[PDB]
């Protein structure tokens with residue numbers, strides 16, 4: 001069965017695997033450790049971007065607001081922000097960079113604009129997500145220490161919130177569509193969930209990786225002839241310097257979408 005296949009995969013991999021699939025045709029679910037907490041790592045960047053999109057529902061000028069990028073703003077991984085040092089980026093551009101390239105400076109600028117990680121958490125709560133918590137900025141939110149509740153959520157909570165953000169009632173239509181455009185244009189996920197799916201399916205996703213070999217992806221999936229699927233795959237390991245394992249996320253995706 002699917003459950004037996006995921007257990008075997010987890011056992012052989014030497015870690016802890018969390019999966020939540022929602023089939024929006026009938027709201028059926030495939031769950032595996034879906035109520036356990038996992039470190040989100042950069043998958044949290046979806047919530048920071050969405051919180052700024054929510055602000056833009058009531059403030060037409062916001063997304064074109066310019067933010068200065070200085071050398072001191074740069075942290076450990078900033079492929080887009082580094083190209084704009086001593087220039088500006090708009091909040092929309094920062095949203096795009098955080099999601100499509102996982103730029104950590106872009107994330108921190110969004111958080112600073114919102115007023116801190118607690119403001120991202122409050123946004124999640126406003127959507128009915130009582131599980132999500134953001135505690136730190138980038139890159140320290142990727143420490144992924146076993147048992148640490150900081151910067152964690154559960155696979156099921158994240159699947160439900162992602163469904164609400166991209167297909168449901170969380171955002172007004174213009175904003176919903178913008179988030180979906182950004183996720184579809186992700187450049188970092190080729191070897192993760194996408195690699196376990198039919199090539200012709202359309203995928204929007206956000207990856208994240210951190211210490212303890214923590215390797216995550218959250219995705220919305222549009223099949224060619226069926227209703228969308230929402231899939232969260234979280235994976236973490238017991239040793240701090242473990243290799244990341246995008247291949248395990250691809251394998252899990254293949255397992256839970258099979259037959260269909």
Ligand SMILES: *C(=O)[C@@H](NC(=O)/C(=N\OC)c1csc(N)n1)[C@H]1N=C(C(=O)O)C(=C)CS1
Pocket residue numbers: 041042043076077101102104139140142143188206207208209210211244
């Ligand atoms: C989000 O997860 C960001 N993760 C990191 O920066 C991690 N180190 O932070 C202390 C990290 C990246 S790889 C690894 N073994 N740890 C990254 N956003 C990711 C992502 O997978 O989406 C990368 C593109 C770069 S940074």
